[PDB]
Scaffold this active site. Structure first.
Site, short mmCIF file in Angstrom:
data_model
loop_
_atom_site.label_atom_id
_atom_site.label_comp_id
_atom_site.label_asym_id
_atom_site.label_seq_id
_atom_site.Cartn_x
_atom_site.Cartn_y
_atom_site.Cartn_z
N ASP A 25 0.77 -1.24 0.00
CA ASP A 25 0.00 0.00 0.00
C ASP A 25 0.81 1.30 0.00
O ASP A 25 1.33 1.71 1.02
CB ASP A 25 -0.93 -0.03 1.22
CG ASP A 25 -1.98 1.05 1.19
OD1 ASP A 25 -2.80 1.08 2.13
OD2 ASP A 25 -1.98 1.87 0.25
N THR A 26 0.89 1.95 -1.15
CA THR A 26 1.62 3.21 -1.27
C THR A 26 0.91 4.33 -0.52
O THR A 26 1.51 5.35 -0.21
CB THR A 26 1.80 3.64 -2.75
OG1 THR A 26 0.51 3.79 -3.35
CG2 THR A 26 2.60 2.60 -3.51
N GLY A 27 -0.38 4.14 -0.24
CA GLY A 27 -1.12 5.17 0.47
C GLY A 27 -0.95 5.10 1.99
O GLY A 27 -1.48 5.93 2.70
#
Ligand SMILES: O=C(N[C@@H](Cc1ccccc1)[C@@H](O)C[C@]1(Cc2ccccc2)NC=C([C@@H]2CNC(=O)c3ccccc32)C1=O)O[C@H]1CCOC1
Lengths: 99, 99
Positions: A25-27
């Site tokens: 998850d880059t977020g």
């Protein structure tokens, strides 16, 4: 390896001696794993997003194997719906977003 | 471009003629934006987040520009701390995770 996003980017990680499926998850600033036991001291913390906030336990210097790669960093533990690997660990394995 | 993850992967998006900041979020299946006025009609949509499920408004065929890349798709409007660009739009711009 290149990973497309037609489906959730799930990978296998190894922690505490067992394998688990997690979401790249880059977020996410940090990594959060489902309620489990870990050795060491932790500090309470609250994280929020869609649906509200949840209380988690913050552990430091935790060793986690992502795609046969050893990375060390902060790990949060709490009632998350899915295991999430955040930027704090993604950077360690040289993961980047490209387009 | 190649985006490293040491910092949050924020980009400016263009929707409705105005500029906004959004987060490239591989951990989100859908795209969720903060409250705003969108054209046409909407339908109810239930999505699951870290803190639970919530109801959001769904708008289809919305033109959104991401880093100069035009996309047309479903956008959800609801209570969120940040504008979130999910996989449904990340696939349209040809975004991949590499390491
Ligand atoms: O809610 C999500 N996706 C979750 C991941 C997920 C996937 C499946 C199920 C539950 C959660 C995540 O990717 C989105 C978000 C958004 C956000 C950005 C910055 C600060 C606060 C919120 N990024 C990080 C966190 C969370 C909370 N807040 C944090 O700050 C944080 C920090 C460390 C780990 C995780 C997080 C989030 O909630 O997807 C929904 C809506 C779109 O499609 C479906």
């Amino acid at each position: 390896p290149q990973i497309t996003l037609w489906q959730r980017p799930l990978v296998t990680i190894k922690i505490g001696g067992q394998l688990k499926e997690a979401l790249l998850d880059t977020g996410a600033d940090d990594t959060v794993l489902e309620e489990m036991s870990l050795p060491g001291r932790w500090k309470p913390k609250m994280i929020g997003g869609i649906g509200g906030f949840i209380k988690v336990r913050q552990y430091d210097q935790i060793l986690i194997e992502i795609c046969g790669h050893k990375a060390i960093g902060t790990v949060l533990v709490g009632p998350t719906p899915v295991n999430i690997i955040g930027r704090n660990l993604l950077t360690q394995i040289g993961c980047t977003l490209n387009f």
